[PDB]
Amino acid sequence: KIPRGNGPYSVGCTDLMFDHTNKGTFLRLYYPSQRLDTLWIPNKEYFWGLSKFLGTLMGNILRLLFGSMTTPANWNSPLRPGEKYPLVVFSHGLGAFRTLYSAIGIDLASHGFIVAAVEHRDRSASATYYFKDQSAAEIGDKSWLYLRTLKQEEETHIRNEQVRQRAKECSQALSLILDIDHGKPVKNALDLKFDMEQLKDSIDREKIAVIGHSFGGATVIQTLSEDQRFRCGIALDAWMFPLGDEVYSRIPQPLFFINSEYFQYPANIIKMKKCYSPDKERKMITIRGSVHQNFADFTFATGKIIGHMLKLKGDIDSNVAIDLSNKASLAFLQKHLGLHKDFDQWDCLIEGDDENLIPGTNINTT
Numbered sequence: 001k002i003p004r005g006n007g008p009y010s011v012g013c014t015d016l017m018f019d020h021t022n023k024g025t026f027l028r029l030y031y032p033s034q035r036l037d038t039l040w041i042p043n044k045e046y047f048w049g050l051s052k053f054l055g056t057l058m059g060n061i062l063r064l065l066f067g068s069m070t071t072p073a074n075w076n077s078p079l080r081p082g083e084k085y086p087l088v089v090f091s092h093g094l095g096a097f098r099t100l101y102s103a104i105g106i107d108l109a110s111h112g113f114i115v116a117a118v119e120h121r122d123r124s125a126s127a128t129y130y131f132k133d134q135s136a137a138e139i140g141d142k143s144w145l146y147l148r149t150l151k152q153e154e155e156t157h158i159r160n161e162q163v164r165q166r167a168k169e170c171s172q173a174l175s176l177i178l179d180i181d182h183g184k185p186v187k188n189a190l191d192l193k194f195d196m197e198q199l200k201d202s203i204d205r206e207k208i209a210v211i212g213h214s215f216g217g218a219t220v221i222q223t224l225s226e227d228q229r230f231r232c233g234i235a236l237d238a239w240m241f242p243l244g245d246e247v248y249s250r251i252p253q254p255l256f257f258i259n260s261e262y263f264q265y266p267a268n269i270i271k272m273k274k275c276y277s278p279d280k281e282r283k284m285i286t287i288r289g290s291v292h293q294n295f296a297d298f299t300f301a302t303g304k305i306i307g308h309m310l311k312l313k314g315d316i317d318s319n320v321a322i323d324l325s326n327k328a329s330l331a332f333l334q335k336h337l338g339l340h341k342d343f344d345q346w347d348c349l350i351e352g353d354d355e356n357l358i359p360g361t362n363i364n365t366t
């Protein structure tokens with residue numbers, strides 16, 4: 001029940017791992033393509049990891065419920081040729097992994113973006129895998145890495161080291177895609193029926209953005225601070241705790257905060273406002289009635305009553321919420337990447353001009 005893209009392009013999806021180690025890049029790619037058959041959560045170990053994240057055999061139950069659920073993109077469909085596409089690198093939240101934000105990835109793709117959804121190896125993912133050597137990769141002998149749980153004494157330090165690794169992973173993902181764009185040969189550690197040589201000369205190398213949710217929102221900010229190739233960033237309900245104090249004044253690129261209503265709190269909002277400066281471009285909106293999970297795919301995976309019970313759904317309808325976030329995002333991207341599309345029709349959303357939006361936030365700080 002993950003919504004199809006609202007844009008004119010049809011959408012393909014594939015996975016890329018290169019190199020095969022846990023120091024390499026692992027990403028899910030959404031792209032304009034030339035069957036809506038992509039497996040949403042493709043391995044049992046992801047369900048085990050989700051169970052550990054939830055602190056709960058619970059894993060096998062999740063598996064039975066969601067294990068064959070699909071997401072509306074055409075698996076390994078060829079790339080739509082004849083044009084250069086802007087690129088979004090997307091960063092997932094704590095306890096997530098690369099496949100859980102397909103509602104966003106597929107909608108951006110359907111509007112003509114290539115979206116690289118990275119899977120982080122910083123031990124923030126519920127689960128991820130790699131191969132210990134080429135021989136392991138050849139027979140698909142995966143080595144799994146589960147979420148690390150932290151002592152309270154550890155949190156400050158380890159979360160910051162993690163957000164630094166995440167930013168390095170977004171930069172490495174970008175460097176890989178750009179290298180491929182100029183013809184670098186890559187051997188996908190996953191043996192999939194999509195030729196990465198398709199991506200040669202298909203990226204608009206000047207129109208690069210980073211987007212992310214929660215832990216991924218802090219990753220947006222660390223990445224912008226560290227990598228000037230990214231031209232703008234969109235932080236979806238950023239969890240600001242991982243960031244060091246020094247970074248807040250070191251973000252030159254335009255930055256858009258799109259918040260849920262119920263996730264936010266003063267300690268977090270204050271850090272967002274520390275990013276502000278008269279000489280820099282900053283916007284913020286809050287989606288009325290929304291919760292933290294409105295930005296991820298599980299908001300579409302259950303019915304309304306169960307969803308509200310488990311806080312996967314807010315008072316606002318899930319499709320309406322994600323549509324608002326996606327349209328405001330597209331308008332911001334058009335403005336600060338210099339796109340030649342008609343997304344500026346939603347410029348009003350950036351300013352929070354809608355029944356279901358608040359300009360800035362309703363939380364007040366000094």
Ligand SMILES: CS(=O)(=O)Nc1ccc(F)c(F)c1
Pocket residue numbers: 050092093094095096100213214215292293296297298
């Ligand atoms: C708390 S979070 O939203 O940032 N990460 C997350 C963790 C598990 C999920 F199933 C999911 F959809 C998202």
